[PDB]
């Protein structure tokens, strides 16, 4: 057994680290729609913390960064994240040895971030390539009409209704 999900609907988050790749305003914006994408189809909510321990803690790092799973410099692994629970569970990490972008001319923070949030919420990888829960970086031409896959929707609604 063991199907991890937040038992609380109302969730909290904090951006602790920032990348230099983007302005401090950009990083924030990216994260907001990242959560709102999940928020839209669930009864979840998210509130921001600037201090102390949030449920989902957001970080940027390089190589060793206080967990079992060192990042690997430029490329390959772009980010990883943890299933719901206390402490490092729920967190999401980003490899700053990537070049995070607001647009798709590099590695789009929004796109990567919303995938990893899905993990923080309790979803696993999908085998559907159009699914946001697909593990290979999609990189698409017009972020305007990026849409949540139905798989994605079913997955998160199966956890939270």
């Amino acid at each position: 057994p063991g199907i991890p999900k937040w038992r609380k609907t109302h969730l909290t988050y904090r951006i602790v680290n920032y990348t230099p790749d983007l302005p401090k305003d950009a990083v924030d914006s990216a994260v907001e729609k990242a959560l709102k994408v999940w928020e839209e189809v669930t009864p979840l909510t998210f509130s921001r913390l600037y201090e102390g321990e949030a449920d989902i803690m957001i970080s940027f790092a390089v190589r060793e960064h206080g967990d079992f799973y060192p990042f690997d410099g430029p490329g390959n692994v772009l980010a990883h994240a943890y299933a719901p629970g206390p402490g490092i569970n729920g967190d999401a990490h980003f490899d700053d040895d990537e070049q995070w972008t607001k647009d798709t001319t590099g590695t789009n923070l929004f796109l990567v971030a919303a995938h990893e949030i899905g993990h923080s919420l309790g979803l696993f990888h999908s085998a559907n390539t159009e699914a946001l829960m697909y593990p290979l970086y999609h990189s698409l031409t017009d972020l305007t009409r990026f849409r949540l896959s139905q798989d994605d929707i079913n997955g998160i609604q199966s956890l939270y209704g």
């Binding site: 692994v77 798709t104 970086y137």
Partner: protein, 174 residues
């Protein structure tokens, strides 16, 4: 866990170990490292003869880039390309791992003798957006993802990034 899968050439060149092997059992999870282990048996070795190996290690969960073996072994041989960390073969979600028989001849050649040809002056460069930007005469632009939508495409299945003359690398057929 979000990846940019690499070209087979790039897999080969940047892997310490490249072997062909069969997964023989269920994973065993080792808390203490946060990693889990698959017992394999190595049926041929292409890279790494500075070793003799029969286990594969990957993170314990998908989210944090852990590899889960989908197959349950027809005694499929799998091409595994991965890192040697502290004596141990390591792979992740991003590593190049694939059933041997599903590879094209063009990939089997290459892994065998042709990839190491352009290993370290030539570079395969993944294109995310379509300005793309070439870095140097030694980079080949990998456009399979953009143009056909999935890294399992033509450049990847029939081409390699090889020298033409010094300072110039070009896509070339196997």
């Amino acid at each position: 866990c979000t990846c940019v899968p690499p070209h087979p050439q790039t897999a080969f060149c940047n892997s310490d170990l490249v072997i062909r092997a069969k997964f023989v059992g269920t994973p065993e999870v080792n808390q203490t490292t946060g990693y889990q282990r698959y017992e394999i048996k190595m049926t041929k070795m292409y890279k790494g003869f500075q070793a003799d190996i029969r286990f594969v290690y990957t993170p314990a969960m998908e989210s944090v880039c852990g590899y889960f073996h989908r197959s349950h072994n027809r005694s499929e041989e799998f091409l595994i390309a991965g890192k040697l960390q502290d004596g141990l073969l390591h792979i992740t979600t991003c590593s190049f791992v694939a059933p041997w028989n599903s590879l094209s001849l063009a990939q089997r050649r290459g892994f065998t003798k042709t990839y190491t040809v352009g290993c370290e002056e030539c570079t395969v460069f993944p294109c995310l957006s379509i300005p793309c930007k070439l870095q140097s005469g030694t980079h080949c632009l990998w456009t399979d993802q953009l143009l056909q939508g999935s890294e399992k495409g033509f450049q990847s299945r029939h081409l390699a990034c090889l020298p033409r003359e010094p300072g110039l690398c070009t896509w070339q057929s196997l």
